Amino acid sequence: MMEYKIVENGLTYRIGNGASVPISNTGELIKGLRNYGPYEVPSLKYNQIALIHNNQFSSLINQLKSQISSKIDEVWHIHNINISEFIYDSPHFDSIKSQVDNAIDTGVDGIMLVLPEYNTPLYYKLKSYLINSIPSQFMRYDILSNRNLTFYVDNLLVQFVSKLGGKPWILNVDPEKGSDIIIGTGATRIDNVNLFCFAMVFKKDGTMLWNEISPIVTSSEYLTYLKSTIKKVVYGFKKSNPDWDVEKLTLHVSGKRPKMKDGETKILKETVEELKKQEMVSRDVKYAILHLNETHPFWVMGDPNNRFHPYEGTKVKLSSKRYLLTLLQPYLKRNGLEMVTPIKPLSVEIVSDNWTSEEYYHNVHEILDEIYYLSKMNWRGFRSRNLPVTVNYPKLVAGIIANVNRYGGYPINPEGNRSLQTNPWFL
Amino acid sequence: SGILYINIYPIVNYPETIKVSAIPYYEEFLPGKWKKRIGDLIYLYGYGIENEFDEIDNSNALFGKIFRKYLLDILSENIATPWQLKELGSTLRLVKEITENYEFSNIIKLQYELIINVHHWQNTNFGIIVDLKINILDRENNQRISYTKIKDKYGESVKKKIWVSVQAFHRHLTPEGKKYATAMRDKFNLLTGLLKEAFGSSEDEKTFSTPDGEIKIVFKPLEIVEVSN
RNA sequence: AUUGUACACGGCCGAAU
DNA sequence: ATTCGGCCGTGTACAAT
């Protein structure tokens, strides 16, 4: 006999120069992108992108290059540009790196390399090198051959324009009705070990911007790095804004689950106490720890008209810590709704909080409006990952970095390399 | 419309007070049947109340955390002929061999598995949860293998055979391989029907008999009200 | 690795005292 | 220590504009 509530219709995509792009409509989003450029057009010194591969005069690669030109020149507005081909002719990673060294020496700002096979070690070992220096996009030929290259290269180039330091899209989330500084978390389990990352959010321009990311942290240092990050986010927020933490200082934990006391919440409470003892955060500060989980024994029959699946916003429980939230509604195609397999909704649980139960119900939705607002923020394709960007992005960072370190590749870190911030590289 | 069937089947009726014989914890406490260890005690609810004869009310703190395993242990009794409970504990493992003339059935056997769970909210309402998980089993060997694990072995074209059959029985995809419309509705009609013919009650509700009172399950998904507040 | 959504396995990591 | 809830990896497929 629970009760579910829906976020009021909105969250229209903004891509700069004004926008009215809806959500869950890839056709409409790409139509807007062709009509209106991306949020921050990532023009660079060398208006020239290379495509590095092994094929020679293959019609498929030629069609790929023609599509890349006709789209990035018209849909992503990185103008005054041309696509150059580089050939390594030997699937060994050393030959490929030697070939991409030619593109680096030329100075091309974008490398859309094509691998021949599904080869994990070489893929990650070379992605480390070709991501810690230049925006790029490693892809492979086996899966390139099979499916249509329209729907393929569209998302390919969305990820590409995101990696070029620009922003494909931004969401219409108000400066109010949100958390000023969200420190999200994700994890990736390698050899039964959790590796954590934090997608710090600062509200750089009044709209929730993933401003800077953090490297992998083992669970042993998870709490200490969380304290350091609580301090760093308020430092950066004060530096970039003369405002105060009036609404919240929440978190977003996935891949783990925080404690009620003597753990994540105690660290957050103590560090917020330290911040308020130095006038940095307002007295009416809200800690609002959280926990996010994707797999669980729960499912939902949505309304039958919407392919029996729950709509884009639902909060089914009340007065309990756990809540459920639906994000992936079926895509609204020209004929109707996309036929979809049964989907598993995201479960939100407020592990600990200190709203003192006066307007607790208001602030539960105040967080939960944000996560549905913060989940379509991710820039990896025309499709969302049904996790907040503060959960998707740390997960991707941890996966990429753990894979790179497992194979002994070129080390990556977003702390030492200052240029990695506000420039998606981990996608 | 405006309702989200939440995979919960309500406990429409259950004893207002359940006779729970609280016992100080003892180090050799097996997980056992009809015994729950919440806090630092052992609560010999139901079968085994010969010590205290105690009664625990609805609003008591221990009631909510004892009646969960009480309900699991009383649901682990009345099960129909085909199904076979596998394991009991935090959840109940109800499996059932599949016989639906799926293509290449003589090589790999499919196995419905039911995940019996239970959720309590507001301390005055209850309900059981179900989740399905088909198990891939080679009928001649009865071991756990994956679609990639078969590959060319057991037939390369049979990957298109069990997988399509798996998503068809699971009601995610068509029996041929493509995708259909009412995947979500059939995803739970299957769960409700499977539980109904699993607990040996083709009727809407089964009135299980407990040492305390009578437990009745609506066997229907918990409707969620469209309250906005 | 265009993206997701699912899926089956393998291994499981952690909430509450 | 138990109860109880998840939880992310590697490979099949499916389909969007």
Residue numbers in the entry:
A (entry chain A): 1 to 427
B (entry chain B): 18 to 246
Describing publication, verbatim:
Although phylogenetically classified as a long-B pAgo, AfAgo contains only MID and catalytically inactive PIWI domains, akin to short pAgos. We show that AfAgo forms a heterodimeric complex with a protein encoded upstream in the same operon, which is a structural equivalent of the N-L1-L2 domains of long pAgos.
Next, we obtained cryo-EM structures of the fAfAgo complex with two variants of gRNA/tDNA heteroduplexes: g30/t51 (30 nt gRNA, 51 nt tDNA, final resolution 2.83 Å) and g17/t17 (17 nt gRNA, 17 nt gDNA, resolution 3.56 Å), and a 2.5 Å crystal structure of fAfAgo bound to a 15 nt 5′-phosphorylated ssDNA oligonucleotide. The nucleic acids resolved in the cryo-EM maps include a 25 bp protein-interacting fragment of gRNA/tDNA heteroduplex in the g30/t51 structure, and the full 17 bp gRNA/tDNA heteroduplex in the g17/t17 structure. fAfAgo proteins in these structures overlay with an RMSD value of ∼1.2 Å. Similarly to RsAgo, fAfAgo binds the gRNA/tDNA heteroduplex in the positively charged cleft, which is formed by both AfAgo and AfAgo-N subunits, forming multiple van der Waals and H-bond interactions to the RNA/DNA backbone. The AfAgo subunit, both standalone and AfAgo-N-bound, anchors the 5′–phosphorylated terminus of the guide strand in a conserved MID domain pocket, disrupts the g1:t1 (the first guide strand and the complementary target strand nucleotides) base pair by placing the g1 adenine and the t1 thymine bases into separated protein pockets, and makes similar contacts to the neighboring g2:t2 and g3:t3 base pairs. Taken together, structures presented here demonstrate that fAfAgo heterodimer preserves the g1:t1 base pair recognition mechanism previously demonstrated for the standalone AfAgo, but unlike the isolated AfAgo subunit, fAfAgo binds the guide/target heteroduplex in a specialized cleft in a similar manner as the structurally related long-B pAgos.
